Amino acid sequence: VWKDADTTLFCASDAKAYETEVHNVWATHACVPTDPNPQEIHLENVTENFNMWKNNMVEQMHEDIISLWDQSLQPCVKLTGGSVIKQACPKISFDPIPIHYCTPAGYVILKCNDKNFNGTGPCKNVSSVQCTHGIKPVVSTQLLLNGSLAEEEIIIRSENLTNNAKTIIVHLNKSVEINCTRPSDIRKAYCEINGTKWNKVLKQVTEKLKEHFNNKTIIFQPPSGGDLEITMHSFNCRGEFFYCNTTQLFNNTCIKGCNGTITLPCKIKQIINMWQGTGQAMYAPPIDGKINCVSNITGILLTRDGGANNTSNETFRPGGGDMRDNWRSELYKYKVVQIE
Ligand SMILES: *[C@@H]1O[C@H](CO)[C@@H](O)[C@H](O)[C@H]1NC(C)=O
Ligand SMILES: *[C@@H]1O[C@H](CO)[C@@H](O)[C@H](O)[C@H]1NC(C)=O
Ligand SMILES: *[C@@H]1O[C@H](CO)[C@@H](O)[C@H](O)[C@H]1NC(C)=O
Ligand SMILES: *[C@@H]1O[C@H](CO)[C@@H](O)[C@H](O)[C@H]1NC(C)=O
Ligand SMILES: *[C@@H]1O[C@H](CO)[C@@H](O)[C@H](O)[C@H]1NC(C)=O
Ligand SMILES: *[C@@H]1O[C@H](CO)[C@@H](O)[C@H](O)[C@H]1NC(C)=O
Ligand SMILES: *[C@@H]1O[C@H](CO)[C@@H](O)[C@H](O)[C@H]1NC(C)=O
Ligand SMILES: *[C@@H]1O[C@H](CO)[C@@H](O)[C@H](O)[C@H]1NC(C)=O
Ligand SMILES: *[C@@H]1O[C@H](CO)[C@@H](O)[C@H](O)[C@H]1NC(C)=O
Ligand SMILES: *[C@@H]1O[C@H](CO)[C@@H](O)[C@H](O)[C@H]1NC(C)=O
Structure with missing residues (x-):
């Protein structure tokens, strides 16, 4: 048994530590390696209520991508809030990689497998996972x-x-x-x-x-x-x-x-x-x-x-x-x- 909750997640990736591509660099120091043998547990005859428009994983990922972009992109100048801020603007290597979002101990992620699930309401084919699938953060x-x-x-x-x-x-x-x-x-x-x-x-x-x-x-x-x-x-x-x-x-x-x-x-x-x-x-x-x-x-x-x-x-x-x-x-x- 389990209950709806909101906890801080962690992230995982197959990022390469030698790459200079900014997504790899950020994931090398802010995410852990993806689980080599992930286990998915299907929950027989159970029904759970999902609501994609009220999901805190949304805002956690948004936070991560903001931080990624603020550590990775180097504008020569940012006009923000009435405040000019100047810095060197070297060209960067940029190609997004998939990021997995994962629950800490004591929590887990319920996954909806109803093919025609629209994002809200009941889902009858529900599974359990430690991490989501690899999501590319394309802006x-x-x-x-x-x-x-x-x-x-x-x-x-x-x-x-x-x-x-x-x-x-x-x-x-x-x-x-x-x-x-x-x-x-x-x-x-x-x-x-x-x-x-x-x-x-x-x-x-x-x-x-x-x-x-x-x-x-x-x-x-x-x-x-x-x-x-x-x-x-x-x-x-x-x-x-x-x-x-x-x-x-x-x-x-x-x-x-x-x-x-x-x-x-x-x-x-x-x-x-x-x-x-x-x-x-x-x-x-x-x-x-x-x-x-x-x-x-x-x-x-x-x-x-x-x-x-x-x-x-x-x-x-x-x-x-x-x-x-x-x-x-x-x-x-x-x-x-x-x-x-
Ligand atoms: C959906 O939007 C309509 C029109 O804006 C509004 O009358 C109604 O209250 C909304 N329904 C819900 C469930 O928020
Ligand atoms: C993409 O477009 C360029 C030029 O229009 C062409 O050389 C290339 O073959 C195209 N690639 C694909 C996968 O269609
Ligand atoms: C539930 O989803 C799984 C994985 O997506 C798929 O095999 C099928 O659509 C469903 N399986 C069962 C046993 O209901
Ligand atoms: C995509 O969905 C439409 C209905 O929304 C259906 O008519 C069409 O055959 C589907 N195509 C594929 C490739 O699944
Ligand atoms: C909408 O259009 C299709 C036309 O084939 C029909 O089957 C369906 O019942 C229609 N619904 C309404 C509410 O008009
Ligand atoms: C999604 O499905 C729910 C029923 O679970 C319904 O209340 C809602 O209107 C649907 N939304 C859309 C966009 O189809
Ligand atoms: C584009 O879509 C096909 C399936 O439609 C998929 O196999 C392929 O890997 C996709 N390419 C990218 C870059 O996601
Ligand atoms: C467009 O896609 C169709 C398939 O729907 C195919 O017949 C044709 O090769 C494609 N043409 C171009 C110009 O890409
Ligand atoms: C989509 O994926 C392909 C293959 O990985 C990549 O070349 C392309 O740049 C990607 N598109 C965007 C907008 O990131
Ligand atoms: C896009 O192109 C059309 C003509 O094809 C033009 O009328 C329109 O102004 C363009 N959009 C913008 C945002 O400039």
């Missing part, structure tokens, strides 16, 4: 990259679909590659996506949200203003902060002649708004050479337009900005409990 908006996939149907996760200010996490069951390159203006870049695979998946997503919104017409529109970090698909590739225009991916016409390669325009930005919320940071100009990152789109973050309770349409725009939802999309099936 991005609009598109969730390099995560895990939904096992059966595409899942729609939200704390309250009725409230349109609550973000909608869409868990894909089929990854779609995004291939972003700054070839050898040095900040010019672009991302290539297979149109036929994206639009097929995009159309499957519309039918799933049709299921949740009373078979209403689902419409995609690009962000309605805001900072470039959420108006564009922002992510970090090999240390460089990429901003990509995704209006070509949320086009309701193709859900005809759009079957080849979609090419998103991208820019590498030196001056950015921190996702930690601490203000602005300036980095050095990009490195020479082919900057390339091939990633899997495994989810989409959407925010639905409000005020359409009188009309026949529901309109959605790529959302994000709160990185907790990024960690939320991977920690949704885990919950901490105390042994009794």
